[PDB]
From Swiss-Prot:
The protein's Enzyme Commission number: 3.2.1.58
Protein name (database record): Exo-beta-1,3-glucanase
Alphabetical UniProt keywords: Carbohydrate metabolism, Glycosidase, Hydrolase, Polysaccharide degradation, Secreted, Signal
Comment on activity versus temperature: Optimum temperature is 50 degrees Celsius. Maintains 70% or more of the maximal activity from 35 to 65 degrees Celsius.
Active-site residues, Swiss-Prot/TrEMBL: A446 (proton donor)
pH relationship of activity: Optimum pH is 6. Maintains 70% or more of the maximal activity from pH 6.0 to 9.0.
Binding, substrate: Q118, Y138, G139, W140, Q161, W390, R391, A392, D393, E424, H425, Y449
Record's function text: Exo-beta-1,3-glucanase that specifically hydrolyzes laminarin and laminarioligosaccharides, producing glucose and laminaribiose as end products.
Induction: Is up-regulated during growth on biomass, i.e. when the bacterium is grown on cellobiose, xylan, and various pretreated switchgrass samples.
Length: 549
């Protein structure tokens, strides 16, 4: 019954080099979105292949910008794609929920500025010059994620606390602050943690680039990159990238008003899903139980589960590619928000794994929201490549009970890989890992700010809940470049026993861990288990562990 293909709707702005007043049109979107942190507006800016002059595309909230060529250099800006922090007086720590992909930039002063914090991916980009990751003035910033990109010149983080870069090429790298992690990055600075705090891996164990919309002549298609094992450098540097092109008419083009029943029928009938920019309320889980289904969002397309249901369930199948979606909790508590596979799923998916990419979760902030566990990863071999799972610390509908969310991510499957894992503020364990042979490359956590007192976070005989917990029964696990920060501003007398908790076993290893008290608001007692120095002072100096056990 469901028809594939069709128009992308009014929230997808499509430009070509002859479009009149491109600058004016992009500036109009930016004026609307610049400080629109919790609004319901959503935009995707899409540029047809060609050359664009005299352009400074300033990117505000819920705005994605992208080229429509097969390769990044097919769509070239003589100009910039800019994120700065003017709206927040130079503070970039609320620069969320936006993206840039599949463009070449020739920045007007030789350096492009992408001064972002969480959920602001920078993918498949070619910067013909430098890349500045800091706001003008070098104020606060908490990014960040770069993948499959080539930066001809230097990447300069300056004040950025931490950063993850994978499968990329850089001309240089200026500095590190607390945790700069690299995997498969040509030109990455050599491993040197703690000083500078560089965690450097030669290759990424497995990666698969995010699917993207492009134009084949006048036909819209979605390119679906093939996976790489031991990846290094860009996927597109040497011409033809391997992968499949899916015609747009093989996608159900989701637009506001669609029901989960219609969406589920579309997948059942063999269509992929393309979520146009908008906010979608569902009264039952979106269910993806067909192998190789692509579920791709544009313009920070958002799914809100009503009536306490789960927003998204992926079945026990190979090859599902979920990308570019925000899942936003409803005020009625959901048991789970996102489930990948069923409870106890024990089949493998090694050759053709399911992946979540640029999948973001929010609980509270745009009104009250609640969920018990945000993402449960049951399926073996699943790849989590850039996620921000965030219990809101500011906005509307926020409070220790008002937007309670006990658990962020729970990984139960085996051989799960997380690259670029950002999880913050949950009332209990931000991340728990129960499956075997888990790997995490880069972790950023901040603990809940609003714990009212010590008793409220007592975890048996432990003060507080680990930001990252590996179950005692696990035999094999490995993490690289991982940090947990605390800011107990409701009760600064609080003590957090550790950032990390894990069994002491030969096969369970950690590299480059740190915990940080932000301005002395609470302190850590240790880094992992009861190992590592406590934090002290109010000077925000990290306490570090290079190797564990
Ligand atoms: O705004 C809401 C969001 O808050 C996010 O966490 C912020 C956290 O980012 C902030 O940290 C700052 C650090 O950024 C700052 O780093 C210094 C660098 O800027 C400077 O260049 O170098 C020095 C070291 O040489 C760094 O210390 O340092 C200050 C303390 O001096 C930290 O406070 O702290 C905020 C609380 O004050 C905290 O809210 C959070 O991740 C988001 O989830 C949240 O929505
Ligand atoms: O006008 C161009 C300028 O726009 C603003 C950005 O912050 C700069 O990176 C850029 O050079």
């Amino acid at each position: 019954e469901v028809v594939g293909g069709g128009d992308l709707g009014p929230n997808v702005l499509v430009f070509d080099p002859s479009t009149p007043d491109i600058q004016g049109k992009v500036d109009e979107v930016f004026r609307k979105q610049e400080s629109n942190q919790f609004g319901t507006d959503r935009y995707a800016l899409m540029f047809k292949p060609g050359t664009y002059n005299d352009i400074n595309a300033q990117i505000g909230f819920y705005t994605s910008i992208a080229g429509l060529g097969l390769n990044p250099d097919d769509t070239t800006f003589n100009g910039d794609v800019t994120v700065d922090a003017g709206w927040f007086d130079g503070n970039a720590t609320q620069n969320f929920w936006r993206s840039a992909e599949n463009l070449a930039l020739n920045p007007v002063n030789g350096t492009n500025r992408w001064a972002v914090s969480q959920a602001a991916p920078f993918r498949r980009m070619h910067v013909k010059g430098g890349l500045n990751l800091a706001p003008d003035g070098y104020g606060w910033a908490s990014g960040g994620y770069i993948a499959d990109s080539k930066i001809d010149g230097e990447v300069g983080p300056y004040s950025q606390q931490q950063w993850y870069t994978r499968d990329s090429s850089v001309g240089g790298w200026g500095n590190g602050v607390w945790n700069m992690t690299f995997s498969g990055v040509e030109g990455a600075p050599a491993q040197s943690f703690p000083e500078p705090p560089y965690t450097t891996l030669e290759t990424t164990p497995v990666s698969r680039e995010k699917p993207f919309l492009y134009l084949d002549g006048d036909d819209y298609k979605v390119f679906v990159p093939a996976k790489r094992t031991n990846a290094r450098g860009t996927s597109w540097g040497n011409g033809t990238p391997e992968g499949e092109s899916l015609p747009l008419d093989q996608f159900y083009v989701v637009k506001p008003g669609a029901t989960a029943e219609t969406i589920n029928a579309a997948v059942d009938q063999g269509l992929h899903l393309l979520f146009t920019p908008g906010v979608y309320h569902v009264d039952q889980p979106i269910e993806i139980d067909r192998a190789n289904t692509v579920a791709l969002g544009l313009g920070l397309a958002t799914i809100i589960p009503d009536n306490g249901v789960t927003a998204l369930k992926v079945g026990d199948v190979d090859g599902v590619k979920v990308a570019g979606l925000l899942v936003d909790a409803g005020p009625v508590n959901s048991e789970t928000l996102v489930e990948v596979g069923s409870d106890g799923a024990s089949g493998d998916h090694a050759a053709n794994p399911t992946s979540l990419q640029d999948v973001f979760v929010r609980i509270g902030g745009a009104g009250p929201g609640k969920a018990t566990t945000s993402i449960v990863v049951n399926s073996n071999d699943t790849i989590i490549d850039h996620t921000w799972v965030w219990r809101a610390d500011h906005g509307e509908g926020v409070g220790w009970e008002t937007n309670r969310a006990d658990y962020g991510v729970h990984v139960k499957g085996d051989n799960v890989l997380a690259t670029g894992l950002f999880v913050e503020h949950f009332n209990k364990y931000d991340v728990q890992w129960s499956g075997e042979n888990g790997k995490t490359i880069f972790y950023q956590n901040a603990k809940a700010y609003d714990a009212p007192d010590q008793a409220a976070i007592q975890n048996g005989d432990i003060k507080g809940y680990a930001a990252y917990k590996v179950d005692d029964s696990v035999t094999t696990h490995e993490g690289w470049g991982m940090g947990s920060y605390c800011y107990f501003n409701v009760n600064p007398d609080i003590r957090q026993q550790h950032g990390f908790q894990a069994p002491v076993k030969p096969g369970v290893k950690f590299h480059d861990l740190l915990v940080v008290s932000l301005g002395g608001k609470g302190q850590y007692e240790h880094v992992i288990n009861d190992i590592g120095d406590p934090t002290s002072g109010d000077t925000t100096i990290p306490s570090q562990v290079v190797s564990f056990p």
